[PDB]
């Protein structure tokens, strides 16, 4: 009956393999079955109930690797189970799920910096590539707004980006929209009550505090409240009707702070922390686990 705010992988030193669930009603984090390789720089999501974690990067003493894994979590039986990888490894990735499939946008692979975009049918165990970006987006954010994908913002390899494009699924094609009013590489972004909304990132200046939410009605970028703590490579997603913000990077602390935005009062609060500050962590929220 419960959902939780499910936390996957991240960066401190070297890439991490938790999984642990927040419950934001009695404040727990619960311990879960590790990542089968430690990543940084993945997505998360669900479908049919499953947590997904997707792409990211293996930083490790003994070496470093991109990664092209899906991997599934089911919490009726806290284990992990490996998926159909995607076409190419994927760092610093953003992900939405439209009817079902998952859209696996962007990212790194070594000095690679990708536009191209591919998409996973669960039923099939089968990825398979779609149309690519007009622009290679790393740390991109992607949200899906009426079965629409939208990418915002990232890092193109010279040029850190305030511009956000569209994909059609119907057309097989990405068309531009009104661009962020500010420049944002790493933010988190996600859907809340028929809006875009990016949080926080980098500019190639500075980890930003600020908020802007896009309506599709007007086409049109508006700042909300500021967080409290300036972040870049944050968490983010959505539960029961607040964003929440997990973690991130300040240009000299990984962060465990967790923050929660009432869209009511328009205010963000800290509401928990996490047992380690990290950054780089996939996020998606579903049921609790099953213990009996
Ligand atoms: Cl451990
Ligand atoms: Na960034
Ligand atoms: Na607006």
Known sequence: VGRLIYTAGGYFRQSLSYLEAYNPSDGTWLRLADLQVPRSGLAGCVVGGLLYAVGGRNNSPDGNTDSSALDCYNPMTNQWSPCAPMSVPRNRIGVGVI?????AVGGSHGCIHHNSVERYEPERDEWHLVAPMLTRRIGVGVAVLNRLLYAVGGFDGTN????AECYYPERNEWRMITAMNTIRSGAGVCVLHNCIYAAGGYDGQDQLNSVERYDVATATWTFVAPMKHRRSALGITVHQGR????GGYDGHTFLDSVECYDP???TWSEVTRMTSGRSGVGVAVTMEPSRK
Do not use: A, C, E, K
């Open 160 to 163: 850190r980006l305030n511009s």
């Open 243 to 246: 964003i929440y913000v997990l």
């Open 264 to 266: 009511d009062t328009d």
């Open 99 to 103: 009817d079902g499939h998952i859209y």
